[PDB]
């Protein structure tokens, strides 16, 4: 598996507008909400669950990086894997997307896979 | 269990106004005080205790997040489970609330569970 | 044991003015000096030692919190237990006070035991 | 093995201008892009992969240090070992350079091997 | 052993002017260069190496503290133990000094052993 696998989904030129931290089923988790920097389109919501899924090892790295980009409001590419989380109220509150990477976008194309 | 369980309580548009770090019964812990951004109501106090209660796994995550929101002073939604800490002197100084989640807020909506 | 126990001592309306980190007998340690925010009184010196005393479990949390309040310079209540450290040269450089808690203070109250 | 081995390459007076975090083959990784502060030259891309290559042990230290220099914009020397990563889409997105060191730079020299 | 043992050396009223992070013999390490705050004297160079030397337990504490003092530029006392690192190329690039403590300094004094 790889953040960059074409079977994942990415959204370029976004900003992290909201951040949530909590716990589910004995695992820490966080979710972010992102929107296009220019206000077009619809938000993206993705979560990381520290104990769950193949992406679990990257939980702390992703949380630290989400926190930094959330604090700066700089443009980013968000990378997700769709349809991972299953608890109905959780998915309804947030989404089923697992967060699988974050790329800065300070230049013409974001610094990450496409 | 989940931060968003309906048996938990939450308080929207709160500012984390105070922070305390200490130790009880072998466990580092922290507590925060929060107040409505609009100044109404009565303060909320909630604590997390390392290796104690079902919420123990998220102790570090919540401490780091409380520190961040405390430093910015932004309005957040605080999620707690009532009646978790039972040490009476501790409860009298702070509260029995376990902190179980923190959500950032726009002017109109906080990013976390509700209802 | 508890930070708020009557057998501990506290000092309110203090600012953390100095910070030191070192190692003693295989254990990292740190010390802080605090002075009354209004200039009165005698300074307070306390240390935490990562592998020593009943307060060992809270070393990293107090180190992080001391660093935070040291960087902001804000008014705090410092909680100590006296007569803990025993190495005479260490005590004479710093003190025998173990650091057992840190509470933020507003103008006329602090958020912690008293 | 050492950051300063003659078999590694380095680039001075560079500024970290992009940062990416993700995961590949169960391993967290990050990549950075640096460009000459004076605008000359070709960008340098390098990645660290938490449990791959002989440089795996320094992943967290270099991630944290990359974050710091990225946030200040200061001029640094970046040390890499060439031709390490092999997954083609990863290498073509980023590069094959492993990140093996970061050194602050002054006007005339930098603080590290050369 | 203690940071404050008379057999260690210290240098007062210094500023951390350079920071380097790398890896050697499976260990992430960092070195710092410090100079007198008033601009006089000759620079000091010290390193801390993960999992190496009796000072290994304090590696992360010293790294975090060095980064903070480096970021502020404030006056500090640096404590070292001479003749610890033996790799000649490493010593020739940096030095044999192990970093063993860091103390904040006021205009008046430094908060640490002397």
From TrEMBL, chains A, C, D, E:
Disulfide bond entries: 31-47, 105-110
Transmembrane regions: none
Keywords annotated in UniProt: Signal
Residue span, Bordetella pertussis toxin B subunit 2/3 C-terminal domain: 10-110
A GO CC term assigned to this protein in UniProt: extracellular region
Name recorded for this polypeptide: Pertussis-like toxin subunit
Species this protein is from: Salmonella typhi
Gene that produces this protein: pltB
């Amino acid at each position: 598996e790889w953040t960059g696998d074409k079977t994942n989904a990415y959204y370029s030129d976004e900003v992290i507008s909201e951040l949530h931290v909590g716990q589910i089923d004995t695992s820490p988790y966080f979710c972010i909400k992102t929107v296009k920097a220019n206000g077009s389109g619809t938000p993206v919501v993705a979560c990381a669950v520290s104990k769950q899924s193949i992406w679990a090892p990257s939980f702390k790295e992703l949380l630290d990086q989400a926190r930094y980009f959330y604090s700066t409001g700089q443009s980013v590419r968000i990378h997700v894997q769709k349809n991972i989380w299953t608890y109905p109220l959780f998915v309804n509150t947030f989404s089923a997307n697992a967060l699988v990477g974050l790329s800065s976008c300070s230049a013409t194309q974001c610094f990450g896979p496409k």
